[PDB]
Amino acid sequence: KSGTWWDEHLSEENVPFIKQLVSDEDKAQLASKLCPLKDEPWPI
Amino acid sequence: TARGTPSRFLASVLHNGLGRYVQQLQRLSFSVSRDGASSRGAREFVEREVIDFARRNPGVVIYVNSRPCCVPRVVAEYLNGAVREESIHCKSVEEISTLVQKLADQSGLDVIRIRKPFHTDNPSIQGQWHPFTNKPTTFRGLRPREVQDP
Amino acid sequence: LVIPPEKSDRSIHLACTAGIFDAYVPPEGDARTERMKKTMASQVSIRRIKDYDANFKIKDFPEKAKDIFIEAHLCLNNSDHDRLHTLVTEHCFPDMTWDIKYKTVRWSFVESLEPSHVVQVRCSSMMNQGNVYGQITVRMHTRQTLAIYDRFGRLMYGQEDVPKDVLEYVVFEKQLTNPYGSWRMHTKIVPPWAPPKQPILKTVMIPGPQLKPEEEYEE
Amino acid sequence: ISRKWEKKNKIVYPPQLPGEPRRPAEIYHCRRQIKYSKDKMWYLAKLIRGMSIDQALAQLEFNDKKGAKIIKEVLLEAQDMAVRDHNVEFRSNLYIAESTSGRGQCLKRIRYHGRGRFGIMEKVYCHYFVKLVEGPPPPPEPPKTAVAHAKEYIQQLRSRTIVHTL
Amino acid sequence: QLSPTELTEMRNDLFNKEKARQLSLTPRTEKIEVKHVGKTDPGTVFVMNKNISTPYSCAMHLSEWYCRKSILALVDGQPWDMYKPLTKSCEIKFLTFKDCDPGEVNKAYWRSCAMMMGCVIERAFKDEYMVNLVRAPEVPVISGAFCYDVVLDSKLDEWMPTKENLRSFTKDAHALIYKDLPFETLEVEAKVALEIFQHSKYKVDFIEEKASQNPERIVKLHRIGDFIDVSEGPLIPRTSICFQYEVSAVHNLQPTQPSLIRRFQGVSLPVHLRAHFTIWDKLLERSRKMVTED
Amino acid sequence: VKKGFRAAFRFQKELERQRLLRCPPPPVRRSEKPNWDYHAEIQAFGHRLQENFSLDLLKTAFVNSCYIKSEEAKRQQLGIVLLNLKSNQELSEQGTSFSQTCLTQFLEDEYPDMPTEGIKNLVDFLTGEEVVCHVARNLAVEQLTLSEEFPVPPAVLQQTFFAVIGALLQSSGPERTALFIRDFLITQMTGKELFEMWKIINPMGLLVEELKKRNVSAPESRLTRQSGGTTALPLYFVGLYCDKKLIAEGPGETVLVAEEEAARVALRKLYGFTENRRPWNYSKPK
Amino acid sequence: AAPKNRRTIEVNRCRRRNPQKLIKVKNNIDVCPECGHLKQKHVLCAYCYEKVCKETAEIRRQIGKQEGGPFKAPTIETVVLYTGETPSEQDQGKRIIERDRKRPSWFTQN
Amino acid sequence: ISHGRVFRRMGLGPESRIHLLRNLLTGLVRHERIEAPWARVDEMRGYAEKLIDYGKLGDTNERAMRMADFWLTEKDLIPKLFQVLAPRYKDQTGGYTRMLQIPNRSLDRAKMAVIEYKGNCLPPLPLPRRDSHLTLLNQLLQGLRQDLRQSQEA
What we know:
The structure is cut from a larger assembly and holds 8 protein chains of 8 kinds.
Chain D (H helix, E strand, L loop, with lengths): L25 E9 L3 H11 L4 H9 L4 H20 L8 E10 L3 E6 L5 E6 L2 E9 L11 H13 L8
Antiparallel strand pairs in D: 1-5, 2-5, 3-4
Helix pairs in contact in D: 2-3
Chain G lengths: L8 H8 L12 E3 L6 E3 L5 H22 L10 E5 L12 E5 L11
Parallel strand pairs in G: 3-4
Antiparallel strand pairs in G: 1-2
Chain H lengths: L13 H18 L1 E5 H18 L6 H10 L5 H12 L8 E6 L9 E6 L18 H18 L1
Antiparallel strand pairs in H: 1-3, 2-3
Protein name (chain A): Large ribosomal subunit protein uL3m
Subcellular location (chain A): Mitochondrion
Family (chain A): Belongs to the universal ribosomal protein uL3 family.
């Protein structure tokens, strides 16, 4: 019932790994959207 | 309160009067003083009234206890379990006579506000009104503005 | 209750003593030369008890003691603390009633496995303060039933229907000089070799040392 | 004055029958004549109502009010009282069943104002009252749901009579 | 033979009866002395009732903090369920998820979650079908998913669960968590368990293996509600310990020819270590990979 | 401190009344309270009802077995025969049996189309602990009852009540006793709907069986009236039709409820136990 | 400005007991794993901090006894040694503070 | 409006603030670890880091000596700064202190901190530590990391 934040229970080793993991995922989600016209756009 | 007090509906005890009438007063207990001036009229009632009242009321047990008391009291008990205490302090024999008869005629239900001056378990014989009582029915039970045969 | 009264011609008049004059050491294995010397001292002391009450019969005492014992323990079931003060001494009354001020006691006497046997008789130092006390030790071996309930009426110890055997060495004391003195329970000798009492019902936590921050824990 | 709270630990119940459920232990404790407003004490007493003994001790240990330390002292000796004198087994198996403040006996002093005026200053004292009951803290009453609302509404619709008629 | 409901009622009765039997072996109160040997509250002795008091009873003497945090007990150096009655004077330590080495707590939690999945799998399928629980493989925690090997009906040898079906297993598991059921245990002799698991061949084979390693041929049983199973070790005290719980994947093992063994996989975290929604997704995805124990 | 006595006395009486309301004492037998002459109470009991009881019989109707067993237990405990008191076991059996046939005769005559199952359930209701103990308490029966534990348990009160009916049967005969049953048990049906006394399940099942015995076609359920269909407070009327003829209609918040209600309505009409039926005739036969 | 009317206890109870005025339950309390006493998550343990402060005060009393006057802070590093300990190779040329007790398990010799 | 105002209003005014922060910083240099109200320690922390950087300029730097002379009101601490504290932090580029909240002050309930120069000879503070890598969560993440490393190599 107590509150928890994302890195509360993580260890010294897992904190840098998790940050790199979430950052890399975001950068690649953004890179996956850079070609809207090859991804079945709606009518222009 | 009326808003400051209890209330009830008109009732009887065990449907009294319906098959037969039962007097609901079952007991009376008097406490008169032998010497106290307050009990002068309660002594006179015991002398010339209580015996004739007992014969008219064979279903009521009367208990006269003569003891030193400053306030003569009669205690009425009813079949429904009700117990009512009435002072007869400094009442004359005729006042006590009327009081005792009043107790004998009563039912023992609470003398509080009665909400209605009538009671019935069968308020309707033809059927209680409802929103459809006086409405006509229509062919196939169709609703207003309803397409038929879809 | 804090300070004994001060110097006056009036002093506290006691009706009992603090302990056992000569502590009968129950010999090992009394559940079921020097021996002769023992009976000597007891005989000397029965004499001094008869030096105040000629009618005292050491042979009828075991039965008297038994009644005192039972009656004293039947007061603890009704908290009849006026009668109890007649059957026990002021040194004993606290020991039987303090721990049950808000408990319910159900005690019963079932049987006597053996007749009670007076095992020691000792008197007090002649003219201690003008008062002479005589203590009679009695070995009792009976079956008792005990069930102690707590404030809220929950069984706290014992069982209410199971009788068990009890071996006690109860010391009685009388104030011989006192004209209205009587024989009353004065204490209970507990043999070191006695078996341990039955376990209580609830669990307990014995706490550890309560350390200050500076202090560290010694194993 | 009245000292009824101190006599409630002297009630002796009769032994229960074998079939009856175990009666929980109840421990009444209080501290009289605290130098503190009863109104301020009220909030701390309100805070811990219904908590486990341990929750209340936790919440008071990290409260900044002066009243928190006094209530914490009272709770701890009432917990000691419970297991030592009232035959409670687990010292943590206790909850706050009642927790309130009361007015103490107060003193009166003069407070000087300007222009030869003055007010009367009341040096204030209060009482803290706690009743511990054996067992887990009762669960909080769940919030009323839409189902319970609708059931209650329909129930009021079904209990209405025809008013002022036969 | 017995219907599924009947087979359940039979097992509990045998379980309840064996529970009562071991209780009768100590009629009179006997007091053991349990010494506390954890760092905190050092030197406390719990004078407890032999064969009645559990490690949870000693935790109740200390504080509610112990009761909530203590996932497992170390009784004379051996991992001990918090609800397993203590049997003799001993030293006791309590174990939490956040100890410096919670290796054993992790295993306890890990086989506790597999047992919860087995309870869910057994009751998930329609009565037309035959669900024979096989085993809960002891996979390391670092593998990413607790497993439970099950042999389903042979009519189902073409059925693989859909994503909506996996959600059904998960919703059933969360019902078990919401019930907040304690993990009841019994250490019984192999003969007693073989009677309980007489119908199930794989359990008899498993029970025989477990009895073999111990000289006394004693096997450990656990029950949550009406579900009984044979365990590899201690479990956690209650099902409410679990917070994040999901049945992730189902993998048909090979060779399928003799008998189609289907490995159910799940991942979970307890309330004490709940992860962020984003981190929980990364763990959900890896749990779906097939865990291949040695 | 003010002079005087009266206000202090009067205030004492008010503090005493509050203590009673604060700590009400345990109820005791009226016989254990002042002003009680058992013999005079018994005679008043019979006269109230306009009955010629035999005081010997009436006195035993009130003696219960649980009481005589306990009274002897006290006798032995106190080391104290003259207590050869006959209980009311026999007197109850006569009264209970007569009551059942008398009610059955009453009800079968008045409701000649009620099935035997219904009449049996009415008789069980009129002779049940609920009504009999209610009627007994309000006729001073429990005050005169010699029992072991007070308040008199309902099973004991029901036995005592029928023991008093048995005493009336021996004293006055069946015709006089039938009139007592009419005046105190038949009266306890007034106001009551049929199935408030005869608890049935699936009235649609019963209706089919009753209509089959009468060689009538199975009823067809049809919606006669409807309001607020899509709302949380709908009204439905379902009509039951036999050969395209309405036998009953019933209201309801659901169709399932309105249909079962129509079935109870049809049963009430078939069995001749409708709400507008002729009232029970309590007139003295001429 | 003065009140035109007395405020009733019913009005005052609605103000005094308003959830805004009530004390809030804290949810960041936990047990210190080292000592078992309670603490807030973001605050140091009161008990463990006191233990460390009591020994720091003892060491500081020793530093006081050596310096023996104001304005005598040394120009070299300091080391605290406990009974049975000797200066290591890297403690040469440091002011040594001797404590007459055993090294605490938590104050490791680094 | 106090947008972008980076300093606190403390003491009796701006000169008073500095004198408060100076007295605190002087105590920190003597004792290596002081406790004080949390906001003052927060405000003083920036200066304690800057003092080390001036000490790393060396005692032959006239500006650094003039800065140290202002900030250290007990003059034996000026040689300690240049010869003890600064050589201790020659490897580090920053982070010479650590500051931690301790329980509120008893008398006025003030929020409090403890601040210390790192690498002092005092008994260690009971610092907060991250969960062990061996917890259930951290072992599931460890597995995740190595699985990635394996696929990354592919």
